[PDB]
Design a protein around this nucleic acid. Structure first.
Lengths: 106, 98, 83, 93, 96, 106, 79, 98
DNA sequence: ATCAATATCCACCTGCAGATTCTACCAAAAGTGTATTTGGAAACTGCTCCATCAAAAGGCATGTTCAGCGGATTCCGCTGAACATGCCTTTTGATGGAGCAGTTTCCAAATACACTTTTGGTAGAATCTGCAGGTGGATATTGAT
DNA sequence: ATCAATATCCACCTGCAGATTCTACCAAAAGTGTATTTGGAAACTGCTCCATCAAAAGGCATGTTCAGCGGAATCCGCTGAACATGCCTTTTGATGGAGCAGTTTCCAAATACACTTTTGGTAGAATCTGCAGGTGGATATTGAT
């Protein structure tokens, strides 16, 4: 057998997602493409954030990505930051940033 | 006797705490708080360890944000010291003022 | 045991740390109490919804999903605790 | 037994950079993310397939969803990706 | 053969007159009372189904509606709404 | 024949509600308790607002309720105000208010 | 230039209802920009709906929905 | 010649508009503004007469609510004049910011 | 304090835009017997939550000293308010003309339903390495002299 | 400017907790075959949305005059920051036991079709009236002397 994932060229589980769509919206029929399309968008997005989190990890001179890296990745990217309004990254931390008025002397 | 001027250590702290990610509230004192409140709602409850931690994650995040906005408000009033009326303006604009 | 006045567990040192990560450099003295006020409200609300979900599931244990589910109601999504 | 996206997140992780690993904690986060968005999309998908009095969630609904749900640039590259994968699937057999 | 647009109009109007026989409701006003009923209706059934889901239940019942309500309405408002609801399901049952 | 709504002791469409509860949340078996509860709750809420709106109408020397009244009614009741964060009552205006910092002087 | 069709006098009237007393002269353009972004966001999502519905006419319900997801709910146009 | 001192009329204007509920933006101009913007998204588009009213209702409401918050910000900075920055701080805290 | 220029409030009248009442078709709720499903009940399991315990150091609390921030105050340059003015254009009401929705009626195309075969995940276990945490010292920032 | 006090940044080391591979059970996808069903397509009616034209009124753009506000500048009071002191309570880690969350087997009570008969609700028409809108005679408010 050949996983639908392979057929469509994705890593994410196409079938597993047709199932998750059903267990969630029973009523509707799911075109054979929807779970496909879904898995493709989700792998895309996850790829995007991993690309940034990895770099973030590497600059930090770390061989393993952590939540703080994912934050900094998402925090510094305008659109991922937008996509994640009201999302709290546990153990994530905050973007360092001091307001100028707080720096002393003259 | 050496001694930093007022404000030098704070900026030290800010850089310090903005670089890290550990929780800033004592865990046990917080757990008592969570149970005290829950108890005052429904007696004989149990909490998954993770639940308490989920709650503390949520709480600390929440206040760190309220503090960021509170700080915009102080600075907006040409101040560097946050005050209650700062927290109040931030909360009000956020829709919380309930 | 009897739990009483545990909001005082949110100590001044603590609140200062929270404010430092929040980027604050100076803190009025009336902040610490103001803040516990604000905190007890948010916490009571999250817990209140959470416990509701729990009572609905007919359980005697507040689970992580409960809290998570509760936080989403307040429009705050939490990552790193999902099932 | 309980399922998650980890293996996949991990597969994808290895393609962006082979020498980088991920903490279980950070993996716990990539999971909240996938599950989160997976829901947002499907939920607009029906809330959409519905508004038009339809009884089927198709790649078309999924796509409109995505359009509404994502920021300009991410939305585009996402739509391509899906558009692409569905095309490919519609020829695998 | 043509459109039969349904609405909550007549009902809002009854509830209105039922206690204010000498007080009319403008058109636009009725349109808002409509958006309200629809709005809330949605939130409730929405949460209610959501509730069933968490508890792997295949049925949306009054139980979930009441919980949905507690989670959706403010303090005293929910208090009374629940009383009204449980009181309704009661009479519907203490009969047929 | 007898209407469930009649048996329920309500004005709102228990029958119709049920139909809606189904058309909207389609894969769920729906107990008869549900549509009845809904009817009763949404009726109360309706009644609730209408009460205050009318007070505002009369308060205004007017015999017909308009959006301006519903808003005034909503914006003045703490709980109705809370329940409707986000709601924008078309043509309801705002609630009369002038900071004292703007006030003339005296 | 359609935008500027949003006159200073109008903006000022809005702000009055908003309870404002004095108005920096820079406000007007500033208000024009903000409003532009708002209408853009809504109308963009409205249309998306109009199109996914395979329609050529943006109905009131499209706007109501656009509005909804922006977090801004609107009563009074669901009829 | 009679002449009202500054702010008297404005103060009078506030009371007036907070009493009324009619739109304060010219209808025709607004419509041109909508279609124009809508165009840049989809060509040849019709608008239900009411869908435009809805847009204006929403738009006007949004702005009036924003000025309410902005006014809160001016007042906070000890001013009575709403300046651009007040609008910025306000949108910022709301989470809109751009 | 006392004019006096203006705005605002209140009593009263009435035609009419708009709210209300009304005369019937008909989609939909209510009624009925049968077929399909569900979730509470109950005995059972092992996962994880509560409570202990003893050690101890990280961290909280309390007091002292003073720097510098916040706010009160004075002052003046000049941006916004108020107002009369000349007048472009939004507003109001009609108006067929056809774009274009919502209706219906038919049917090939595409999930769904029920089984059976095949294997990509998952939990546990065996195996490995990034990095937490201490160690020392050179470097940079701070603050007084 | 110079130096003494401290905190910051960094290169090295290494055991071990936690991340990464490694193995076989089992829900679960991936094939097959009809059974049921959308939803685009062709066909067509008609609710409204648009395009043009033509007024008078209600705004709006403007430009002149200046009140008073925002913002700069000076000053000092006292409140928060820094800090060292004293030691409690939070943390850390291993231990036991059971309350209870999760799973499993099953009987009946509730809902779901398939479907027929019974009106409550909607639409367009007939009848009806609350409040806009105008007048005005009086009071209140603002602003100068």
């Amino acid at each position: 057998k050949t996983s639908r994932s392979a057929k469509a060229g994705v890593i994410f589980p196409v079938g597993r997602m047709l199932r998750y769509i059903k267990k969630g919206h029973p009523k509707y029929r799911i075109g054979v493409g929807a779970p496909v399309y879904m898995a493709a968008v989700l792998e895309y997005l996850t790829a995007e954030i991993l690309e940034l989190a990895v770099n973030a990890a590497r600059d930090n001179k770390k061989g393993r990505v952590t939540p703080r890296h994912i934050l900094l990745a998402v925090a510094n990217d305008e659109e991922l930051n937008q996509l994640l309004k009201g999302v709290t990254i546990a153990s994530g931390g905050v973007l360092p940033n001091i307001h100028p008025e707080l720096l002393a002397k003259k | 006797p050496h001694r930093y001027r007022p404000g030098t250590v704070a900026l030290r702290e800010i850089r310090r705490y903005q670089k890290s990610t550990e929780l800033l509230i004592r865990k046990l004192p917080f757990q008592r708080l969570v149970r005290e409140i829950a108890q005052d709602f429904k007696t004989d409850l149990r909490f998954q360890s993770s639940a308490v931690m989920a709650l503390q994650e949520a709480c600390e995040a929440y206040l760190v944000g309220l503090f960021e906005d509170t700080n915009l408000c102080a600075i907006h009033a040409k101040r560097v010291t946050i005050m209650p009326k700062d927290i109040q303006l931030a909360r009000r604009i956020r829709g919380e003022r309930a | 045991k009897v739990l009483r006045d545990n909001i005082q567990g949110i100590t001044k040192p603590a609140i200062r740390r929270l404010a430092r990560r929040g980027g604050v450099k100076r803190i009025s003295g009336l902040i610490y109490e103001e803040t516990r006020g604000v905190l007890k409200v948010f916490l009571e609300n999250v817990i209140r919804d959470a416990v509701t979900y729990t009572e609905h599931a007919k359980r005697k244990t507040v689970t992580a999903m409960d809290v998570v589910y509760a936080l989403k109601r307040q429009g705050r999504t939490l990552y790193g605790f999902g099932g | 037994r309980k399922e998650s996206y980890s293996i996949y997140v991990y597969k994808v992780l290895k393609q962006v950079h082979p020498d980088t690993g991920i903490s279980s904690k950070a993996m716990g986060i990539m999971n909240s993310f996938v599950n989160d968005i997976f829901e947002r999309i499907a939920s607009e998908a029906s809330r959409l397939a519905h508004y038009n009095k339809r009884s089927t969630i198709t790649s078309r609904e999924v796509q409109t969803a995505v359009r509404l749900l994502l920021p300009g640039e991410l939305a585009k590259h996402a739509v391509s990706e899906g558009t692409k994968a569905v095309t490919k699937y519609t020829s695998s057999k």
